[PDB]
Amino acid sequence: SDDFFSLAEELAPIIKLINAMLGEAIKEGASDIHIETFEKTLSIRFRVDGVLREVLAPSRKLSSLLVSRVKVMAKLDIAEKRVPQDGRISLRIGAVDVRVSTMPSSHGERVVMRLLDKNATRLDLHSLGMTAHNHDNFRRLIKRPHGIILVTGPTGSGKSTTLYAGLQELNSSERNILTVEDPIEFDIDGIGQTQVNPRVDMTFARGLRAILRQDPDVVMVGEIRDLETAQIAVQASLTGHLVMSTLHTNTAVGAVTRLRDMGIEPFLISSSLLGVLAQRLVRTLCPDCKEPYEADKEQRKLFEPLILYRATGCPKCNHKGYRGRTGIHELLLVDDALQELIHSEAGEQAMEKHIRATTPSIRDDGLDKVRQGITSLEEVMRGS
Numbered sequence: 360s361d362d363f364f365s366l367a368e369e370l371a372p373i374i375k376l377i378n379a380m381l382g383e384a385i386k387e388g389a390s391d392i393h394i395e396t397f398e399k400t401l402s403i404r405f406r407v408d409g410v411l412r413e414v415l416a417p418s419r420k421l422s423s424l425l426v427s428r429v430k431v432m433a434k435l436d437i438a439e440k441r442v443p444q445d446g447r448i449s450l451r452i453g454a455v456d457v458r459v460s461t462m463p464s465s466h467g468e469r470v471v472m473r474l475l476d477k478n479a480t481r482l483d484l485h486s487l488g489m490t491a492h493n494h495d496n497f498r499r500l501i502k503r504p505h506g507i508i509l510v511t512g513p514t515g516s517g518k519s520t521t522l523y524a525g526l527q528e529l530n531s532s533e534r535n536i537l538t539v540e541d542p543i544e545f546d547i548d549g550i551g552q553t554q555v556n557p558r559v560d561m562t563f564a565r566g567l568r569a570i571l572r573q574d575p576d577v578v579m580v581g582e583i584r585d586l587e588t589a590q591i592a593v594q595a596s597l598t599g600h601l602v603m604s605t606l607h608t609n610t611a612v613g614a615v616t617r618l619r620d621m622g623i624e625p626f627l628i629s630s631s632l633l634g635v636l637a638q639r640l641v642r643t644l645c646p647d648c649k650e651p652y653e654a655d656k657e658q659r660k661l662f663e664p665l666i667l668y669r670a671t672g673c674p675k676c677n678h679k680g681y682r683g684r685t686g687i688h689e690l691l692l693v694d695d696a697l698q699e700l701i702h703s704e705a706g707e708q709a710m711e712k713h714i715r716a717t718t719p720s721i722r723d724d725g726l727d728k729v730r731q732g733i734t735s736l737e738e739v740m741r742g743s
């Protein structure tokens with residue numbers, strides 16, 4: 360039921376159109392949908408496997424309606440027309456994550472729906488691209504009885520993915536693993552998952568307090584945004600729970616800084632923190648069109664002829680010569696000397712200096728993967 364092109368042949372029905380268009384986009388395997396306004400006409404385009412195409416040019420009159428409709432679905436400001444807006448939608452087709460972005464433009468806000476699959480995001484702990492060392496130390500870390508483990512990085516770092524991987528590795532029936540999320544990304548099975556619900560003042564803080572009355576061995580908090588959730592988090596870790604969470608800081612040592620700045624007692628950070636996994640996503644070079652070169656003298660400084668690889672571009676990729684992505688990481692492990700450094704508020708430079716004797720930086724991690732020709736030198740250097 361409900362074909363986009365049929366419904367297009369007639370000039371709400373604006374709800375049946377949007378759903379049908381989404382439905383047709385998914386049927387075609389399209390990555391993105393574009394609704395744009397031009398002075399004398401309107402335009403709908405679909406991107407499929409790189410290729411962009413016009414699929415419909417309905418009357419200019421419809422533009423304000425299709426824009427509004429996508430807004431209300433993504434939970435946004437119908438009134439606001441002058442500034443960018445970004446919403447989310449979860450939908451069942453017969454499950455699709457659709458990211459909608461709008462934008463002021465010379466004849467009407469432009470809109471794109473980003474349409475991602477829910478499943479390609481579901482990776483296990485050995486499939487995130489951790490090096491053998493990081494993998495080993497991280498697996499030994501999440502198996503500890505109590506303390507806080509933070510997964511950190513900027514937006515798009517893949518922090519939710521590595522939490523889920525970690526939880527799944529622990530998901531035995533000997534453990535009681537409870538979760539509070541905003542929202543839940545999916546169901547794991549074996550793990551009690553709890554969504555934050557603003558509609559009843561069920562916040563991260565309230566939910567996490569409740570979790571502790573359910574006798575958990577491990578608890579996950581979707582993220583630590585305010586002092587209050589940090590306070591409970593730290594108390595939970597100090598009373599025999601293993602706690603896992605995220606911050607959006609930019610370095611492993613910056614996690615400590617962020618915690619202090621938020622107002623957690625420096626001593627209490629130093630006695631609860633087990634470790635901080637800082638993390639970035641780099642695109643993996645398309646193995647089909649990736650081209651070998653010989654590193655020049657300046658590129659060598661960063662590391663016989665040294666063979667690295669470069670992007671290029673082909674149909675099997677599209678926009679650039681990259682298919683897929685992988686993680687690069689830095690795993691901070693707390694020891695006696697570092698506790699002193701945290702407690703004494705020594706600062707980022709002194710903590711980093713200490714950690715380097717044992718652990719390589721995210722850049723070195725990235726550079727190793729460049730060496731292996733998994734990714735380009737550009738892709739690693741641009742985030743650094």
Ligand SMILES: Nc1ncnc2c1ncn2[C@@H]1O[C@H](COP(=O)(O)OP(=O)(O)NP(=O)(O)O)[C@@H](O)[C@H]1O
Pocket residue numbers: 479480481482486487488512513514515516517518519520521640684685686
């Ligand atoms: N190791 C990995 N390899 C490939 N893809 C990954 C990896 N880790 C995460 N991803 C994907 O990258 C996207 C970002 O991951 P997500 O787990 O949503 O990140 P995040 O940092 O938690 N997000 P946010 O805090 O909302 O910006 C998702 O679409 C995941 O599929």
Ligand SMILES: [Zn+2]
Pocket residue numbers: 645646647648649672673674675676677680681
């Ligand atoms: Zn390619």
